[PDB]
Design a protein around this ligand. Sequence first.
Ligand SMILES: [Ca+2]
Ligand SMILES: [Mg+2]
Ligand code: NA
Length: 432
Amino acid sequence: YNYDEVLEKSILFYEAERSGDLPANNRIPYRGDSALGDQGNQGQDLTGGWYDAGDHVKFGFPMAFATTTLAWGILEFRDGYEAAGQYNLALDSIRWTLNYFLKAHVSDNEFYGQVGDANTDHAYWGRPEDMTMERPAWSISPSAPGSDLAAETAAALAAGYLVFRDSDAAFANNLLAHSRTLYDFALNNRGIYSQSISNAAGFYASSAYEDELAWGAAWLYRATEEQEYLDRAYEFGTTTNTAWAYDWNEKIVGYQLLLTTSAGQTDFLPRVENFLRNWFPGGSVQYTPLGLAWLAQWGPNRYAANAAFIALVSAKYNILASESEQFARSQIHYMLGDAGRSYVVGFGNNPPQQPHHRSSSCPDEPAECDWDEFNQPGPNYQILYGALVGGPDQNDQFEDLRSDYIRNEVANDYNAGFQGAVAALRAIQLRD
Ligand SMILES: [Ca+2]
Ligand SMILES: [Mg+2]
Ligand code: NA
């Protein structure tokens, strides 16, 4: 597989998800300016960010987690991004959401965590450029806490500081200052963001915020080396529980691995190894007949690519390296085409033609786009290069239907671990 092309197209997927005022060098010809009215309740500019999935909601929790995970992969697998000619484009990719998080952090203890009503948004089928419905914006604050959302965004900002500090120190320093402030807000104003922003509860409900507090602390310790953050990581982290998955809701193995590798903390390594062995063949995750580690019907590709990412970070730091590399390669290669078809839109052999995705489902301007384009039985008019679809059922079956909102789903978080894993595999090619 051409990993250079996979990386190029994965970053193009994120570019096709951009909201707001698009740059002159926009590479997605069917996308234009959209949601230019996104704003806070006092008129604060909230334009930009990524649309979460095939919809036009800006869901701050997965948007931040996808950014943290992408930044981590850029830090660890820079050599693979560079070899692919995609390093500057990867930085541009996450600069987009990091700038959005800065806008959303309107004051020390207020942070906008959603733009768009998901009920209204999902009732619409059409271009983002054609939207006319109200797009409310909701924030977390001392009266409306969201320790999970705030600490995940702090994690993304601290990871961003580390990514950008050697090329754009003014940007990186601004990210770190806001990371510190947002993390203090998360620690001192405690609650579940999807209870305070209740519209999010039907879509990205957070089950617990303690793992985000440990994750944000671990990232701030990597960024600042200040003992108080390492203390916070032990305070809210677990050395006794093994993560079920790595994803936008569960940060456990993320901070365990981060503290083991970047911070040299040996107490967490047994739980990292437990996670890896649970996902490896012979573990606790069932594999489809054709070899996909299949955790659940909702975004199995996302869960497996996330585990592949964790495994490849582990291998880089010589944690079960041979087994981690073989497991990770097997999972990414399933998604690239090993079972007979690619699961990455616009890539490889017979890629998915009907991603559940509004803008790519619309024909070129000036043609009409509405629910006819949801229902139409053929391929999406635009190729959504790089999007990793949710994936097959537990028997490797995939119908490739736009109405299959489970298997044909695409989303920011689906590609986040995937993209870093591909960069890691590219880097291993340089090593060998
Ligand atoms: Ca959590
Ligand atoms: Mg076209
Ligand atoms: Na413009």
